[PDB]
């Protein structure tokens, strides 16, 4: 009962598909169906009664963002055409445009430990690994079903989690892609997000209205979390050392502690409409979180007693 609620500490008044903090939790960026990446200063948003400091127009609708963990000013995007772009938010220019995917790319992630490396996944059923110093993909994994999410392990660039429309999480060692290390079954519908709490703890979300926790050292199921409604949309998943947060098709943000299967708290986003939460992001291991919904509203929330 350390926390019982989420307090709204700021609000910026369509769909925001991604909201992410930079390397220092100083700036954050949003992107979505409006074909624009917007960058905001977190402290200005919290202190003021609102305007992005940078906006970059894109050719296609955006599905995902990932900031570089070493180069402060670099951010990757994935788009509905399949293009994976690395941008510099100071110059506004695209640095790399990776165009090998043949269909919509749903996810991109920059590695924390080898920061020139990034991974993407697509409706074309491929996972591609890229290096910012090379135009062609470094690794290609041909899979059997649409890839909805990819994420690097936070401790090593050799491991990625891949969430698939086949309902499973495929956990790969990129040093030998002939077979995954392990494939985690349990979800009853597509796996829409994968996020690591730590080197050995992986969380997932699915359109079976569950989150699940997995042990990637010993290849074990750990826990299933329930309470929210997620049968259709990408509603967002974010985790830290202790907590999982996700969206819902009821326009509510849910928070779970990793040891407890039902929610610690929830927040009705408000504005009538069938809105859905569409993106969430913790501010590292703190109780502060960014959230956004299908109307494009952004809120800064904080877990509170």
């Amino acid at each position: 009962t350390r926390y019982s609620r989420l307090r709204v500490i700021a609000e910026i008044r369509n769909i925001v598909s991604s909201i992410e903090f930079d390397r220092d939790d100083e700036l954050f960026a949003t992107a979505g169906v409006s074909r624009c990446i917007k960058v905001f200063d977190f402290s200005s948003v919290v202190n003021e009664p609102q305007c992005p400091i940078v906006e970059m127009s894109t050719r296609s609708k955006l599905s995902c963002l990932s900031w570089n963990k070493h180069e402060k000013n670099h951010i990757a995007s994935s788009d509905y055409e399949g293009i994976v772009t690395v941008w510099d938010v100071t110059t506004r220019q695209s640095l790399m445009e990776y165009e090998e995917h043949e269909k919509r790319a749903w996810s991109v992630d920059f590695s924390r430990t080898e920061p020139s490396m990034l991974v993407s996944g697509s409706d074309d059923c491929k996972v591609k690994v890229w290096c910012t110093r090379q135009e062609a993909s470094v690794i290609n994994i041909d899979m059997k079903a649409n890839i909805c999410c990819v994420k690097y392990n936070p401790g090593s660039s050799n491991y990625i989690a891949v969430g698939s429309a086949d309902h499973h999480i495929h956990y790969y060692d990129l040093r030998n892609i002939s077979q995954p290390l392990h494939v985690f079954s349990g979800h009853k519908k597509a796996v829409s997000y994968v996020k690591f709490l730590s080197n050995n703890e992986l969380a997932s979300a699915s359109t079976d209205s569950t989150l699940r926790l997995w042990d990637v050292k010993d290849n074990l199921p750990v826990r299933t979390f329930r309470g929210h409604t997620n049968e259709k949309n990408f509603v967002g998943l974010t985790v830290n050392s202790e907590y999982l947060a996700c969206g819902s098709e009821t326009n509510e943000v849910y928070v779970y502690h990793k040891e407890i299967t039902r929610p610690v708290t929830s927040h009705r986003f408000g504005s009538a409409g069938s809105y859905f939460i569409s993106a969430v992001c913790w501010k590292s291991d703190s109780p502060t979180m960014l959230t956004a919904n299908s109307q494009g509203t952004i809120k800064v929330l904080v877990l509170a007693a």
């Binding site: 169906v33 599905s63 079903a145 429309a165 519908k189 259709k232």
Partner: peptide, 8 residues
């Protein structure tokens, strides 16, 4: 369709 998870 916008931000709808694929269902095969």
């Amino acid at each position: 369709y916008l931000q709808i998870v694929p269902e095969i």
